[PDB]
Design a protein around this ligand. Structure first.
Ligand SMILES: Nc1ncnc2c1ncn2[C@@H]1O[C@H](COP(=O)(O)O)[C@@H](O)[C@H]1O
Ligand SMILES: [Mg+2]
Ligand SMILES: [Mg+2]
Ligand SMILES: [Mg+2]
Length: 354
């Protein structure tokens, strides 16, 4: 009954998924002029900003008063860098409108026309909400897995709607995701810009090739009986999670198969039933996960029939605490409860043994 909201989220993510797919090599080749280092030393690129611009501008054209928690800020960007953001958006418009445009849907309007450099800045900075416990706000990681994006590997365009601290809607575009690499079948049309996954709480999880996004296929986690047959999902970047502790969990559970990839694409593989357990144990216990790294995934996994908690206490994640999660680490799985609890208590015991 977030009908309008689901359509808006889907088409916003779809457009940003094409831009990011198309731009990936040009960004990599021109790292010098396309890539900025933030205050925590992490990267941000033209792609991240462009995707955030398209998405917030679409949300605003359809829902002018809506609040957004977005990862990125325009502060300090030069005009030259911002003209580059605008140019990629307009370039992508020229390809997208020929080939994929959806009738009776607006990305821009009179109030938010997305025409000038000042427009791009204003739009990006509508992402400056700090979240919290009451009411409605959108939650946006324009490129999740920016390091993957830059490695030429996996990444995801991630958008969710939170209401009263609970994620009600999620949409994840995985523009580079090829299912045949994870043993499974690809759907016709997947080749151009990957797949989109999406869910509304209480109504199920679905996917579609991003080029299509009209015909939607219901997804669900699988239910293997023995952990010895299970498959983990873990990140690639050793600084984003505690790989050695994760290997200790696997070894204790007799898991011998894992997949490493960047981004909330991992949640999508889980929801699809191509793996069983998403492990993200914290390296340092002071880190607080950003809600935009987990919010879209939370509702997609839930609707696909899985379970999503922190990595120590075995409690549900609380998306009403602001920009960050107060718990430590994240673990999701296909369930059931007993399997999930086994995984999280192992993770607990591992961390306590430090
Ligand atoms: N020290 C850290 N611990 C946990 N996550 C981090 C850390 N540093 C950066 N990140 C996040 O890791 C996210 C991507 O996770 P992934 O692609 O699964 O490795 C980025 O979007 C960052 O927000
Ligand atoms: Mg980042
Ligand atoms: Mg990001
Ligand atoms: Mg992220």
């Amino acid at each position: 009954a977030l009908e309008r909201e689901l359509l808006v989220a889907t088409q916003a993510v779809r457009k940003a998924s094409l831009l990011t797919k198309r731009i990936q090599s040009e960004v990599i080749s021109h790292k010098d002029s396309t890539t900025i280092t933030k205050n925590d030393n992490s990267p941000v690129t033209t792609g991240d900003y462009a995707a955030q611009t398209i998405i917030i501008n679409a949300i605003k054209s359809n829902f002018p008063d809506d609040k957004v928690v977005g990862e990125e800020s325009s502060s300090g960007l030069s005009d030259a860098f911002v003209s580059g953001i605008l140019n990629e958006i307009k370039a992508n418009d020229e390809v997208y409108n020929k080939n994929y445009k959806k009738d009776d849907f607006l990305f821009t309007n009179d109030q938010f026309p997305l025409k000038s450099l000042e427009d791009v800045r204003q739009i990006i900075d509508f992402g400056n909400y700090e979240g919290g416990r009451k009411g409605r706000f959108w939650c946006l990681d324009p490129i999740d897995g920016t390091k993957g994006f830059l490695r030429g590997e996996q990444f995801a365009v991630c958008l969710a709607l939170i209401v009263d601290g609970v994620v009600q809607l999620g949409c994840i575009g995985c523009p580079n995701l090829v299912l045949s690499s994870y043993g499974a079948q690809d759907l016709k049309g997947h080749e151009s810009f990957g797949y989109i996954f999406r869910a509304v709480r209480g109504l199920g999880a679905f996917y579609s090739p991003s080029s299509d996004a009209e015909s939607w296929t219901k997804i669900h986690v699988r239910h293997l009986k023995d952990t010895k047959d299970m498959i983990t999902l873990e990140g690639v970047e050793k600084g984003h999670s505690s790989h050695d502790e994760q290997t200790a969990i696997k070894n204790k559970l007799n898991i011998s198969k894992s997949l490493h990839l960047d981004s909330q694409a991992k949640y999508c593989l889980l929801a699809l039933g191509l793996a069983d357990v998403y492990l993200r144990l914290p390296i340092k216990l002071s880190y607080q996960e950003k809600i935009w790294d987990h919010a879209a995934g939370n509702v997609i996994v839930h609707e696909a029939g899985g379970i999503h908690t922190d990595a120590m206490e075995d409690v549900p994640l609380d998306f009403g605490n602001g920009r960050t999660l107060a718990t430590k680490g994240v673990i999701a799985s296909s369930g059931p409860r007993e399997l999930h609890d086994l995984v999280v208590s192992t993770s607990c015991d591992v961390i306590q043994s430090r």
